[PDB]
């Protein structure tokens, strides 16, 4: 059921999801206040689904939801993670795509998916294929927030326009966006996207995390840079507190010290 | 209600709809076995909605459904015909378009609409805007069946492909067609379009009418050429009998004589 | 303030006293006095119309023609239309309407053009439409474009407005004020190609503040009746039973 | 279907619009006639076709627009001997030709090259002709088409068999047909000249270039003596190397 | 008929007797004996593999290399792969495989290529994939393309098939037979880039008749175990619990 899958996804709203490679990192994230973890194994090589042993370790390490990545289009990687009992699958462009023409028919799965998007056409096509959660594609591993900004702004600007525009112009808008019409109509009616949309890819600092929230993100994904710090527990907790208290500029100043 | 509007439209299936300019022609069409008539007023000029007096004359002349044309996008021509009690509105590219960017939001009307289409993307966008019936755009006033053939074949070929293709390829197909995704999915599930699709524009002979049926049309629209004959009643009845008995080649030979 | 007084109305092109009186009698809110290079009308025609009615009288000046506009002002016209239908006198600069006492109407096709005309001092706008074709399609295009762009401006994040202004070629402070007011600061009428009662009502349904119609009124066998039909359809633009009856015999 | 087409081999087929023209053609030695009505050009009034069929004892052909299923089915039902799925009529389908395989009546189709030829055959054509250039009286395009087809067959028949798929891909020819052409040393159906034959010398030229026969148009009946002209064309086509005879036929 | 016997199986690239036996023991349906210009393998290697197992043995010939293919045939290989991974000997013409007694496998990327290879005499097909990258994306592309094109051919109106054949560059009579049979006349295996148990099962889910895998099996610390994991995932391609367990430690 759609309502279940989305309701589950919606639970994470206002929070931070962290990339973790083992039980130790998993525990640190949970302890810092992460609402979930993304289990990762992460040179010209092919990036695939993680060794299921790693995903299993992470699932055993924490009580918060655990996510993992499947290559775009990789039906079997996705069915495997589903059978393993992960809480969410990220059909991720950061892994090497298995299918360069067709995304997964996520509607046919019981596990909820997260997908990336850069604009409202991509967002609505991912939702129509059955995505229960969205995120910016951003710019992974660069530490530059600029693409996550661009994507969150684009999606949000396009939503505002759709909500405000004459209803009889929406088919032309759907055609121009490559958006499924019925989803745009429902967006107009609801005044919002039907799923949460997190920032992801390039969130490097407390100020970055708070910025994405200020731009309308529903939460934040952060990467392994957390555990490149001299004190991952402090850094992880700093990202959590900035994402939550995203208008407390005195706090965020303090949190931004010694990075 | 959608189901009502479509069910009404679906009633005309297997039949001939004829363009008529007055009560006399209206009566001849009905008498020849037409399932409906299209009331028409039809030089570099602007072609608009018919004088309501003409539409009224036609509605008074016959007991079969009466259709009339509104310019593409002309909200008020359409609301006027609706208020007048016509049975269907044809939002027609044969009249001079009032809006070159946006079609009518046909969903907001109580009267059913017919729209033209040339391919499945156009068909599904017209349906999504609320069209209850479709037709080929054909090539009006030329008497050349070639475009009606092309459009009926295109729509039908694209439907067959959609019905047969892997479900997980349908979003890519929707994107390529500019088709609303949920409508394609439902087409795949139903094995057919959700509304009837008539041939229109260039049906000149009994053999033409039977051809469109053989190509999968749900019925035929014919133009004023009927009443350019020496014996409109005979010609109109010939078109009706060919459309119905579209595999009776001996009959169609006979009907094709003295044209 | 005087322009907004006309809102919901019909303005009729008239060439003489007789036409002008008919227009007034039909319920026109104003008349546009009218008369190869197309220039300002003979002042004699404009004065004939001014003396013939009590409703506001407008007249046309060539784009950029300072002296035509100052002459009309001196004549006591109520509004000047700086009109692209006359032959432009200046192809690079519009009039600085801020420097005149008489209010101006200008044409526009999009919100950039609208706000530039306003910033130059326009007190009233209209679509450029497509004059003398009887085809409503361009008026529809222009009215939809301006209105669509306004809705987006009203809805969008304030911090994205400067990019929008730069994209539109809009004066930023007008765009900001549009966002704050929820609308344009001046009325925007449909013009160019309104041929039928249904067309007039259509432009109102699309968000127009009123309608300019042309000399085709007087081409009909019963001008007064046709003039009245346009007025009644423009006012009562959602009364489809009325509009049906008015659409008969044109 | 093919053996019947082949019985026309070496003869002249004439366009005729009525029973009189039809009788003249038969009497002149035509092997068959093409019933015509002669703007959208469609299947002829069946009345005309029936008049022609009733007028002569030689085979009667008629035309159907390209892709017009029901026109072709109607002609079939009327008992015509052959249908010409003809580009000289206004095409009813600009994307797809008739599935001639599904009919009992034999079809003739036009072609300009061996790729077209084999595609038409694969769709079920029982006879081919050049497309030529109808109503110009200019033989040049019939020459082009007959030469092209025949040159491509000579090459196919002579070439290395392991090179035939590349040839088929290049021609857009169905591979099995090309392979059988190579095996047989020839096309599997007769191929007539059509479109622009104006003089006896033209008729004989087409045969000299390898045509199996000749289609000719209404120009025969535009002449001062149709019977004599028609006979001239028949004789020049049959006696296509008799240059003294063709000389005499070419007078007046 | 002999090719179809392999359906559902795994074929493994092997360079010597030892690898060959492991492959056989793992449940391979056949082995591909393998050894700058890349040519036919030293016949010594091919014979070593033929003597080492009882399952079918395939070997590679350069595209168009008549004599390499005749030599392999004379040697008693069970199948010849006319392979684009070797350096083509003829860049214009493939082998006339119709003239050989031994069955051939050929690569294809679309249904045009598939039917041309078949018409030349291929008894078996595979994707061209993207060899030695471990990236499954091109095998996915090719298998999806061929299968999508077949479904369309099977569904489409028969009278539109000649346009389709011309568009595809497909021999018409094969396309017609595909429509009638509902499928290709030969098996079509995935090849080039299958790296993991999940990849192998994915290609089966996409409609492949079987899977070719490369020397990466023997790069693992436990070849026999890995070989078995690929076999079991290819057969039991919808058992996600098994496939999960098999995906561990690669
Ligand atoms: Cl996309
Ligand atoms: Cl990142
Ligand atoms: Cl469209
Ligand atoms: Cl028509
Ligand atoms: Cl400007
Ligand atoms: Cl006008
Ligand atoms: Cl062709
Ligand atoms: Cl000719
Ligand atoms: Cl090829
Ligand atoms: Cl490989
Ligand atoms: Mg858990
Ligand atoms: Mg950059
Ligand atoms: Mg009635
Ligand atoms: Mg054309
Ligand atoms: Mg006054
Ligand atoms: Mg135009
Ligand atoms: Mg006979
Ligand atoms: Mg030439
Ligand atoms: Mg052996
Ligand atoms: Mg690539």
């Amino acid at each position: 059921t759609e309502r279940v899958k989305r309701g589950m996804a919606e639970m994470q709203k206002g929070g931070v999801i962290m990339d973790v490679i083992n039980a130790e990192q998993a525990k640190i994230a949970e302890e810092a206040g992460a609402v979930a973890v993304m289990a990762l194994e992460r040179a010209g090589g092919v990036a695939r689904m993680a060794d299921p042993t790693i995903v299993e370790e992470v699932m055993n390490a924490v009580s918060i939801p655990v996510m993992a990545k499947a290559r775009i289009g990789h039906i079997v990687e996705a069915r495997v993670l589903e059978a393993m009992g992960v809480d969410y699958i990220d059909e991720s462009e950061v892994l090497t795509p298995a299918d360069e023409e067709f995304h997964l028919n996520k509607n046919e799965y019981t596990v909820p998916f997260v997908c990336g998007c850069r604009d409202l056409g991509e967002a609505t096509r991912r939702i129509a294929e059955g995505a229960s959660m969205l995120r910016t594609k951003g710019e992974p591993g660069t530490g530059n927030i600029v693409e996550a900004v661009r994507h969150m702004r684009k999606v949000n600007a396009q939503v505002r326009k759709v909500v405000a525009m004459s209803e009889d112009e929406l088919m032309t808008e759907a055609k121009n966006l490559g958006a499924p019409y019925e989803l745009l109509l429902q967006i107009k009616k609801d005044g919002k996207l039907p799923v949460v949309n997190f920032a992801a890819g390039g969130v490097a600092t407390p100020a970055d995390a708070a910025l994405m929230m200020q731009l309308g993100a529903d939460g934040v994904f952060v990467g392994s840079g957390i555990f490149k710090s001299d004190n991952p527990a402090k850094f992880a907790k700093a990202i959590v507190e900035a994402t939550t208290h995203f208008t407390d500029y005195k706090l965020i100043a303090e949190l931004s010290k010694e990075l």
Side-chain angles (χ1 to χ4, degrees), chain A residues 1-2 4-41 43-227 229-236 238-259:
Chain A
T1 309
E2 197 159 282
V4 184
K5 289 180 183 168
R6 293 179 184 183
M8 291 168 44
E10 201 174 332
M11 308 205 261
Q12 275 62 260
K13 194 189 261 188
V16 175
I17 299 168
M18 303 187 186
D19 292 346
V20 306
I21 66 154
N22 61 37
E24 165 158 298
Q25 295 189 346
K27 289 176 191 292
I28 290 168
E30 180 169 49
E31 187 67 9
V35 298
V37 289
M38 173 67 66
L40 273 196
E41 212 179 292
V46 174
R48 313 185 180 86
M49 170 184 87
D51 185 339
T53 303
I54 294 173
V55 180
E56 279 176 16
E57 185 177 314
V58 172
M59 284 172 298
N60 289 330
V62 300
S63 299
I64 52 172
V66 176
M67 312 191 162
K69 299 187 199 252
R71 290 182 271 176
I72 289 169
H74 205 308
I75 293 167
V76 175
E77 280 184 345
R79 286 293 181 189
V80 162
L81 295 168
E82 184 181 53
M84 288 168 61
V86 300
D87 296 292
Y88 299 82
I89 301 180
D90 184 345
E91 187 181 12
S92 171
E93 73 277 1
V94 178
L95 305 184
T96 309
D99 195 325
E100 278 170 14
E101 299 164 324
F102 311 104
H103 283 67
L104 291 164
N105 190 0
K106 292 161 284 290
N107 295 312
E108 293 310 330
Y109 293 69
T110 61
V111 67
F113 283 75
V114 56
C115 303
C117 66
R118 298 174 282 178
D119 60 64
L120 193 52
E122 281 190 331
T124 56
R125 294 189 294 276
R126 295 304 83 76
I127 293 151
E129 299 167 341
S132 292
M133 175 179 194
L134 290 168
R135 62 168 169 70
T136 63
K137 289 181 161 166
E139 198 177 78
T142 69
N144 191 352
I145 203 59
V146 72
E147 294 306 320
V149 171
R150 191 194 310 281
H151 306 156
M152 190 51 67
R153 275 197 187 274
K154 187 58 160 171
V155 176
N156 288 340
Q158 288 179 319
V159 169
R160 294 190 194 92
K161 187 181 107 162
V162 161
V163 170
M165 69 194 289
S166 161
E167 181 179 327
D168 61 7
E169 301 177 0
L170 263 192
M171 174 57 76
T172 293
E173 186 72 10
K175 195 193 187 313
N176 289 332
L177 289 176
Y181 180 77
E182 294 297 325
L183 272 176
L184 277 194
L185 194 53
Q186 195 65 47
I187 292 165
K188 176 153 185 77
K189 294 177 179 160
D190 298 345
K192 56 173 185 168
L193 287 175
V195 297
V196 304
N197 185 199
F198 275 37
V203 176
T205 71
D208 294 339
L211 171 64
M212 292 318 305
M213 297 311 289
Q214 181 91 60
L215 298 175
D218 290 307
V220 168
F221 289 87
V222 298
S224 296
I226 291 200
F227 297 98
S229 66
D230 295 355
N231 192 348
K234 189 180 221 312
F235 192 20
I239 297 291
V240 167
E241 299 188 341
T243 299
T244 296
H245 298 284
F246 63 80
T247 60
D248 181 350
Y249 307 121
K250 287 161 164 35
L251 176 63
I252 292 161
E254 292 309 315
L255 300 180
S256 300
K257 293 175 167 177
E258 324 276 22
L259 291 202

